[PDB]
Amino acid sequence: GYITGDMKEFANWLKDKPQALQFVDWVLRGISQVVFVSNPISGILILVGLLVQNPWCALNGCVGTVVSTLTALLLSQDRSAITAGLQGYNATLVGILMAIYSDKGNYFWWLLFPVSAMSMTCPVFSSALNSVLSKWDLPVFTLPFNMALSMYLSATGHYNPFFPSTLITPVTSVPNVTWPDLSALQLLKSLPVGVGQIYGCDNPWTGGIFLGAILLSSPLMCLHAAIGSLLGIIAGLSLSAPFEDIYAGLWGFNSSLACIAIGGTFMALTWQTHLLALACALFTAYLGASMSHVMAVVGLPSGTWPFCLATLLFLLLTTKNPNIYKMPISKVTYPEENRIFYLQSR
Amino acid sequence: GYITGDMKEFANWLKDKPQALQFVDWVLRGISQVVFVSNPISGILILVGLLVQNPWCALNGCVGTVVSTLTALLLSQDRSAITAGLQGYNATLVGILMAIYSDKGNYFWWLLFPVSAMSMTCPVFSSALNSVLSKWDLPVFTLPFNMALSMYLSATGHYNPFFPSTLITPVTSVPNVTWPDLSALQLLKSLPVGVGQIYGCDNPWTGGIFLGAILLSSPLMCLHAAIGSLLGIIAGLSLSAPFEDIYAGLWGFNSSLACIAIGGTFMALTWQTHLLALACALFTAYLGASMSHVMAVVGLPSGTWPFCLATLLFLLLTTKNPNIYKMPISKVTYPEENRIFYLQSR
Amino acid sequence: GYITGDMKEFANWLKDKPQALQFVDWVLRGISQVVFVSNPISGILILVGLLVQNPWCALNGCVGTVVSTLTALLLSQDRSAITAGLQGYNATLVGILMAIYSDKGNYFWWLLFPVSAMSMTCPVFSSALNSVLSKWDLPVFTLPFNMALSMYLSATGHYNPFFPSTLITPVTSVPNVTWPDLSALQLLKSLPVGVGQIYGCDNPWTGGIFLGAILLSSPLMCLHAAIGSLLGIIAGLSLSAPFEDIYAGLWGFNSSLACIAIGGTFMALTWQTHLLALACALFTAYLGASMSHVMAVVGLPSGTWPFCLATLLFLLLTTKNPNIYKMPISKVTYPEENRIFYLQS
Numbered sequence A, B: 001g002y003i004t005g006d007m008k009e010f011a012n013w014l015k016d017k018p019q020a021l022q023f024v025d026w027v028l029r030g031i032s033q034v035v036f037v038s039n040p041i042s043g044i045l046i047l048v049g050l051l052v053q054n055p056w057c058a059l060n061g062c063v064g065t066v067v068s069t070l071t072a073l074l075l076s077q078d079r080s081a082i083t084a085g086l087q088g089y090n091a092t093l094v095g096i097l098m099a100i101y102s103d104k105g106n107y108f109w110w111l112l113f114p115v116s117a118m119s120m121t122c123p124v125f126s127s128a129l130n131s132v133l134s135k136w137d138l139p140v141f142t143l144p145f146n147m148a149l150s151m152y153l154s155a156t157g158h159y160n161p162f163f164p165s166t167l168i169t170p171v172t173s174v175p176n177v178t179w180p181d182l183s184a185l186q187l188l189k190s191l192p193v194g195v196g197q198i199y200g201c202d203n204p205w206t207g208g209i210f211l212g213a214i215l216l217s218s219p220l221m222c223l224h225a226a227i228g229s230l231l232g233i234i235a236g237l238s239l240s241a242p243f244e245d246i247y248a249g250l251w252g253f254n255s256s257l258a259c260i261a262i263g264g265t266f267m268a269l270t271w272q273t274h275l276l277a278l279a280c281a282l283f284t285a286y287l288g289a290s291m292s293h294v295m296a297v298v299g300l301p302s303g304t305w306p307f308c309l310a311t312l313l314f315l316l317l318t319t320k321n322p323n324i325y326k327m328p329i330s331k332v333t334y335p336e337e338n339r340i341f342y343l344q345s346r
Numbered sequence C: 001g002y003i004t005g006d007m008k009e010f011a012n013w014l015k016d017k018p019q020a021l022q023f024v025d026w027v028l029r030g031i032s033q034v035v036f037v038s039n040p041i042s043g044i045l046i047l048v049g050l051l052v053q054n055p056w057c058a059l060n061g062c063v064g065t066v067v068s069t070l071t072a073l074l075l076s077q078d079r080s081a082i083t084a085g086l087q088g089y090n091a092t093l094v095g096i097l098m099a100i101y102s103d104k105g106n107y108f109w110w111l112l113f114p115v116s117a118m119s120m121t122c123p124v125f126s127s128a129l130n131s132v133l134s135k136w137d138l139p140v141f142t143l144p145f146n147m148a149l150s151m152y153l154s155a156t157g158h159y160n161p162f163f164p165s166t167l168i169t170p171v172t173s174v175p176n177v178t179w180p181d182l183s184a185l186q187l188l189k190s191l192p193v194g195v196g197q198i199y200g201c202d203n204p205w206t207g208g209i210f211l212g213a214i215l216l217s218s219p220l221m222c223l224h225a226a227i228g229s230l231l232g233i234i235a236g237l238s239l240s241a242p243f244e245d246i247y248a249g250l251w252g253f254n255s256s257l258a259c260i261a262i263g264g265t266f267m268a269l270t271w272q273t274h275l276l277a278l279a280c281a282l283f284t285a286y287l288g289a290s291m292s293h294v295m296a297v298v299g300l301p302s303g304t305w306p307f308c309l310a311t312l313l314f315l316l317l318t319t320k321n322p323n324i325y326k327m328p329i330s331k332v333t334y335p336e337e338n339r340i341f342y343l344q345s
């Protein structure tokens, strides 16, 4: 039970100890914060998943986390945020997806320059976005990652002579979809691939491993991760998306994140907020189609912009239903503990 | 008499009456709230106009209004707002323009699935936008409609195999405009067609009906709806827009809305405030051009985004002219009643 | 010293004097407010710069400045802001860049109609944007200009029969860049050309004049203008931009504005804050490429949107370091005097 949730005991114990280990704690908590987890073991496990996918991306992820963390220290950011990993997770993503969307292949070592540079912007985006969003008691989610990646990918683009990005072009014809070819086996693989694509990973073992890491911290988060991935799959089929897009988990990652967020993490989990999480996840998946189409016209991927905009929208919803309750940000940990706080004062 | 303005007395009467009839009334107010009117008779007249245009569009509007009203109830939204029609007007438009912008033409029954889905969205957009805009005492206008429409039409796009939208492409050459051919009687028809296009109707008779539906509530609103359409035409000629576009009322619907909003509804009506409505109306017509061009690159229509942004812009204007007064949201009804509050304390 | 900084002695003296001479003053201070300077001599110097570049662009600038200042008066806007020149600078840019981005060339007199119209929007954009941004004590910078320009240029486009804009298309192939041809002298000349490009002037003399106009008001502002422009050049090189783009100052004008803003104008000037301006200026140049690439898709230029977004982004940054201090809007003048307030608060 010491390796579960928050790992609040371990961190209080670490407070006494060498700073380099304390730092490694933060980097690991930073990696896990992508899926709203603050748990170093979960972090190590996720690293394994990233290494199984592609050690090059894993490395670019780690450089990101470390560089961003150093930068928050440099700029005197809130230390409680840094120890929770809140200053590492955006750049984890920036490092990984900068490598995914690079046209130069694995171990193009120069990539480490712009990865380090874009990772330094992550605490600047976070603080600035917090100055606005904390006024409505909202989180910044991965807006810093998504701004950083959109900025970097459009600044370079596919024709940059140093750091060309992969070419992305809008849909320009009706895809032929032959429904008798739809495959149960591939759809089932799509569920964990959807969770894997939260870190831009299409290996179903990696998504399997990520589900494992979440389970360790909070089974309620694990459940909503899987359900959101499923609802994304359903949304894709409902709009007749090419099957291979659904198979590659492209319909599932934004949905999965949205479902975790609303399903107990930033809303207290009741039956009502569980239904709300199902709605948000479907909504998020459709916004993903929308953002993908539109950002393809300017040669950009959607990233997790859909998850960010969808979820902020649902958190801004007010209701006279007392069973739908927004967590105070200063109180957000994980669903099982969140629900206790809510039950105490309802 | 009792069928004028806001029908306060009929509203007070209905409160004891059957649930089903009160619901009919919320829906009809929902319909009229597109033009800032809360009047069930105006609602009936507008509905007649929609049936004169295209009964398919009328049906989708009505479904939209009903689903949204029901979703606001399901989500325990504010009753005053529901009864006033404020939870139906966005989805009225969502239904109509999803039909207007469908490439599958009339009585494509499948369209009822995404219309309902997107109508369920409108209370969530309204509530989230309120949480932000109410902090400046601003209304959401048709931002929920325009967000839903934009999301829907880019998520599907012209190449969706299930729900293709109408193809929209950017301007790629100088249009040839033959000035001698300009028809005076055609510009005169453009005025009521501009008003018809508020509900995506290009039939001049339907335009006049809407003008009449508005008249019944408020003559001042009617006058500004007409002036706004006119100014749009003038802006269109000033930029050498193709005649066919002016004639189909595409330069007049946003203008018309902006003019009504500023000309007595959201600003107290004075002559200074009347001049401000004219300026806003012109500015809106021009922002319409801008948004149309830019959104066309991604295959989207402007919708009423230009009305929403311009009017919000003009409502955030501050002045040390005491005759330019912004109405408290809580005191906004229609220009004749608004004006009494201004005379009392300004 | 009477023609230094804010020229607040002259301003007080002018108060008693004929309304029209005062007006010329506000107009001249409108011109210099593009670079956050409130100084009529600076404004005249900058005006001379514009004439050196292209008198037709100079004319459209002044017309914009006048129409906007008049519109601010008409709409009963704050007098304080009008006499400081905060109601003329956005339309100065509006006018200049509407001429630069017109496909019709010099002395196309009809251009004066939409220049005037778009200049009247500038006080409206300013007031509306203030109503939002003043809640975080943020200034509007040149968002009114950039909104008005983006609206105008996209409402017309390259294929408007009356007012075609210049055709802008996105990059569609890898540029060929010959590194042995790189010229130190041209790169050195790009520094003042970058400052020139703040008012859309590619003439290195003009940009040299602009640096002089700034220096007259504030040497610290002049220094950061030069530094901001330089870091723009480094950014361009770091992404292998075509040399001619670097040479024409296209990587330096956003950078330069950001570096002046953060380097003592909107942030108190310190060690840390200087470093922060270097960081902001680099970031801003990268955002310039991003915004130019993306906006070219819809046929629009970046204007100074990058400067506006980056600088607002860095002023929304909070820190537990007391040497990184944000100036209250009501106390902002120029670095030299801003620093006094800082040491005294």
Ligand SMILES: CCCCCCCCCCCCC/C=C\[C@@H](O)[C@H](CO)NC(=O)CCCCCCC
Binding pocket: A132, A147, A148, A150, A151, A152, A154, A298, A300, A305, C132, C133, C287, C290, C291, C294, C309, C310, C312, C313
């Ligand atoms: C409220 C008052 C305070 C105002 C403060 C302003 C905040 C400043 C943020 C500036 C950072 C912008 C950089 C992000 C993305 C861009 O790089 C690109 C270029 O347009 N985006 C893209 O082309 C794609 C991104 C589209 C996603 C939608 C954005 C909502």
Ligand SMILES: CCCCCCCCCCCCC/C=C\[C@@H](O)[C@H](CO)NC(=O)CCCCCCC
Binding pocket: A132, A133, A287, A290, A291, A294, A309, A310, A312, A313, B132, B147, B148, B150, B151, B152, B154, B298, B300, B305
């Ligand atoms: C101040 C703090 C509040 C922050 C809260 C965030 C609010 C969340 C709402 C976001 C939902 C967006 C859905 C709307 C439109 C999209 O489908 C796409 C986005 O590319 N629109 C388009 O493709 C075109 C849209 C262009 C319209 C002009 C832009 C205003």
Ligand SMILES: CCCCCCCCCCCCC/C=C\[C@@H](O)[C@H](CO)NC(=O)CCCCCCC
Binding pocket: B132, B133, B287, B290, B291, B294, B295, B309, B310, B312, B313, C132, C146, C147, C148, C150, C151, C152, C154, C300, C305
């Ligand atoms: C907090 C609530 C207050 C709400 C206030 C509403 C403010 C309304 C402002 C709307 C005026 C827009 C005019 C400017 C640019 C447009 O012409 C077009 C949009 O398609 N430009 C472009 O497409 C290019 C512009 C892109 C720049 C990126 C924006 C960060």
Ligand SMILES: CCCCCCCCO[C@@H]1O[C@H](CO)[C@@H](O)[C@H](O)[C@H]1O
Binding pocket: A107, A108, A109, A110, A112, A113, A116
């Ligand atoms: C953040 C600083 C990290 C600097 C590492 C960059 C070193 C350059 O690395 C180079 O990358 C090329 C591309 O794959 C290889 O072909 C070369 O062999 C390699 O030396």
Ligand SMILES: CCCCCCCCO[C@@H]1O[C@H](CO)[C@@H](O)[C@H](O)[C@H]1O
Binding pocket: A110, A113, A114, A161, A162, C238
């Ligand atoms: C931050 C500044 C560092 C810039 C690093 C320069 C990267 C050079 O990258 C080079 O790009 C060429 C394509 O044009 C390839 O042919 C070379 O193999 C590759 O090394």
Ligand SMILES: CCCCCCCCO[C@@H]1O[C@H](CO)[C@@H](O)[C@H](O)[C@H]1O
Binding pocket: A182, A183, A184, A185, A186, A187, A234
């Ligand atoms: C929840 C989403 C709906 C699931 C649709 C299931 C359609 C699967 O279809 C099945 O695919 C198998 C491939 O493994 C084939 O062997 C079967 O013949 C076929 O019936």
Ligand SMILES: CCCCCCCCO[C@@H]1O[C@H](CO)[C@@H](O)[C@H](O)[C@H]1O
Binding pocket: A179, A234, A237, A238, B161, B162
């Ligand atoms: C979970 C939602 C699943 C949506 C139902 C998918 C079944 C669609 O049905 C398909 O329609 C196509 C027309 O585009 C035809 O070409 C196919 O033959 C037909 O089977």
Ligand SMILES: CCCCCCCCO[C@@H]1O[C@H](CO)[C@@H](O)[C@H](O)[C@H]1O
Binding pocket: A238, B104, B110, B113, B161, B162, B163, B164
């Ligand atoms: C909620 C999910 C509902 C999706 C089902 C919609 C199926 C679309 O229906 C199909 O549309 C095709 C083109 O639009 C037509 O060619 C076919 O006749 C029709 O089967």
Ligand SMILES: CCCCCCCCO[C@@H]1O[C@H](CO)[C@@H](O)[C@H](O)[C@H]1O
Binding pocket: B179, B180, B234, B237, B238
């Ligand atoms: C509201 C203001 C509208 C101004 C429209 C004026 C249009 C006439 O203007 C002129 O018309 C000629 C055609 O006879 C063309 O040859 C010219 O190119 C055109 O400038």
Ligand SMILES: CCCCCCCCO[C@@H]1O[C@H](CO)[C@@H](O)[C@H](O)[C@H]1O
Binding pocket: B238, B239, C110, C113, C161, C162
């Ligand atoms: C405020 C509205 C007035 C509009 C002014 C219209 C000016 C038209 O200008 C005309 O444009 C044509 C190009 O299409 C050219 O053939 C003409 O030479 C040119 O004078």
Ligand SMILES: CCCCCCCCO[C@@H]1O[C@H](CO)[C@@H](O)[C@H](O)[C@H]1O
Binding pocket: C182, C183, C184, C185, C186, C187, C233, C234
């Ligand atoms: C900003 C720092 C980048 C390095 C700039 C120097 C690179 C230019 O290169 C220099 O250009 C000169 C032209 O004036 C030539 O005479 C020199 O031979 C050449 O070395």
Ligand SMILES: CCCCCCCCO[C@@H]1O[C@H](CO)[C@@H](O)[C@H](O)[C@H]1O
Binding pocket: C189, C192, C204, C205, C207, C208, C209, C211
């Ligand atoms: C900081 C003050 C700015 C210095 C400006 C340097 C002006 C160099 O300007 C140069 O002058 C040459 C001869 O006149 C011309 O042939 C070149 O085209 C021009 O670039």
Ligand SMILES: CCCCCCCCO[C@@H]1O[C@H](CO)[C@@H](O)[C@H](O)[C@H]1O
Binding pocket: A161, A162, C179, C234, C235, C237, C238
């Ligand atoms: C501020 C950082 C400046 C970066 C300078 C880039 C150094 C140019 O590096 C160039 O890379 C080319 C690949 O495109 C090679 O073909 C050339 O031989 C090499 O000179």
Ligand SMILES: OC[C@H]1O[C@@H](O)[C@H](O)[C@@H](O)[C@@H]1O
Binding pocket: A107
């Ligand atoms: O780990 C370091 C090495 O990994 C290899 O797979 C790459 O091909 C080499 O370029 C690199 O130096």
Ligand SMILES: OC[C@H]1O[C@@H](O)[C@H](O)[C@@H](O)[C@@H]1O
Binding pocket: A178, A181
């Ligand atoms: O893509 C559809 C294809 O799938 C196969 O399973 C069928 O037997 C082919 O005849 C068909 O063309």
Ligand SMILES: OC[C@H]1O[C@@H](O)[C@H](O)[C@@H](O)[C@@H]1O
Binding pocket: A271
């Ligand atoms: O607590 C979970 C349960 O809550 C009840 O209120 C619902 O009616 C059930 O459908 C649900 O399974």
